[PDB]
Amino acid sequence: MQAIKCVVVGDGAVGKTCLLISYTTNAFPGEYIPTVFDNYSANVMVDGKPVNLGLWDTAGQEDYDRLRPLSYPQTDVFLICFSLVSPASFENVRAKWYPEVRHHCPNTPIILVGTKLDLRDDKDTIEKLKEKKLTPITYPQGLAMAKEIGAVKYLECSALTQRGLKTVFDEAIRAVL
């Protein structure tokens, strides 16, 4: 049965750890957000074919440009992430994450994931951004970035509400089959 290594990369602002925890446990972690998600594997059927899905977090490694690539080899698919309410994380897709992923894994499929979809319509978040003369990242911005980096899909999800979250990982799998 097919073994799939999936590595999740992106700025601290995406909430990588939270995303993976909320995916695997089927629930936002709630009170306390844990800093640690240990390498995971579980069975899922996708289009009727069962698969063993491996998930590796990368949180903590954001300032170590030569340590991050230790996780990259033999990866079957990347989730490159940005928070939908941090233009900086989105710019970093282009500036930081896609470059190092193509350098190390030139023929490995990428899904571009926008996280924190639930905050894109939040007044307080919207306002906090307007005070820095910025706005959240909208759908066609994602699509345009996905294209630019060669992503197989652009997807939007929330760990909080679970909207799009199961789909992210289904499509990660489909991109390898």
Partner: protein, 179 residues
């Protein structure tokens, strides 16, 4: 409450780290050192390259560092001291990370399904590659847990700042040592 949830994670994930290294040593390493199975000539007697100094890192955590963290369970605001006390021991993560690319190359080019075969046999969720990234993960993870403690500990917080300084410095030194 936040300081308590963080210390509890620090401890729980420490126990599991020790468990995970222990597993790694008494399966993937023990097969090779035992002499109970057919060892590809390409990896033979190169277990020092494959596993690097992971034994010594395990001994540190299992003999000392987990026993000492446990003693800070009810003292979360002081746990930075623990990392200062044992700072020199974390220098072995520099050595480990320096060697990890050589370990990956080796397993790719010369080990075939040797370790895949062992995984299947023993029924392990984690590949040897999964186990062998763990030290890299763990050593970057401590500075996350200390930052979290800084967001919720008062003017008794030089007993974190210096802990953190150390645990920022170890991974940068590991990072700065790669070719």
């Amino acid at each position: 409450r936040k300081k308590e949830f963080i210390m509890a994670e620090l401890l729980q994930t420490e126990k599991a780290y020790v468990r995970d290294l222990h597993e790694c040593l008494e399966t993937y390493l023990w097969e090779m050192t035992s002499g109970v199975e057919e060892i590809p000539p390409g990896i033979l007697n190169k277990e020092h390259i494959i596993f690097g100094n992971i034994q010594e890192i395990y001994d540190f955590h299992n003999n000392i560092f987990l026993k000492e963290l446990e003693k800070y369970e009810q003292l979360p605001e002081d746990v930075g001291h623990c990392f200062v006390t044992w700072a020199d021991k974390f220098q072995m993560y520099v050595t480990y990370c320096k060697n990890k690319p050589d370990s990956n190359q080796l397993i790719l080019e010369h080990a075939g399904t040797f370790f895949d075969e062992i995984q299947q046999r023993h029924g392990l969720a984690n590949s040897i590659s999964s186990y062998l990234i763990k030290p890299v993960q763990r050593v970057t993870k401590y500075q996350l847990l200390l930052k979290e403690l800084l967001t919720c500990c008062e003017e008794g917080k030089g007993e974190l700042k210096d802990g953190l300084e150390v645990m920022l410095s170890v991974p940068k030194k590991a990072n700065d040592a790669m070719h």
